[PDB]
Structure 1
Amino acid sequence: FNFSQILPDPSKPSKRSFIEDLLFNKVTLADAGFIKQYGDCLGDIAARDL
């Protein structure tokens, strides 16, 4: 049996598998950072998104 597609990948910085990486890339988060910290919002540039 082949479990390399679901076992964690040590090459990635976060220990997620190939399928977990596909599931994280397919779901488009609005903003998953939660690290705005009011310093990003001081500059009013159009790249700031909502």
Structure 2
Amino acid sequence: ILPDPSKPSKRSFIEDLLFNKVTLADAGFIKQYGDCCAQ
């Protein structure tokens, strides 16, 4: 759970797993505008 300097982001293994697990299936609106940008 501690961050490591071997990765560009100041996260850990458990933190990156959380970000890569919660996503959207392109069935909404945030991915079209929020995450990149095309309005």
Query: Given the alignment of the two structures, is residue 13 of structure 1 paired with residue 1 of structure 2, yes or no?
Result: no
Between Structure 1 and Structure 2, whose CA radius of gyration is higher?
1
C-alpha RMSD of matched pairs (Å): 5.2
CA contact (8 A) 2:3 2:10 kept: yes
Give the alignment's TM-score, normalised by structure 1.
Answer: 0.44
Unpaired runs of 5+ in structure 1? 1-5, 42-50
Aligned structure 1 segments of 4 or more residues deviating by more than 3 angstroms: 29-41
- Unaligned segments of structure 2, at least 5 residues: none
- Aligned pair count reads 36
Aligned residues: percent identity? 100
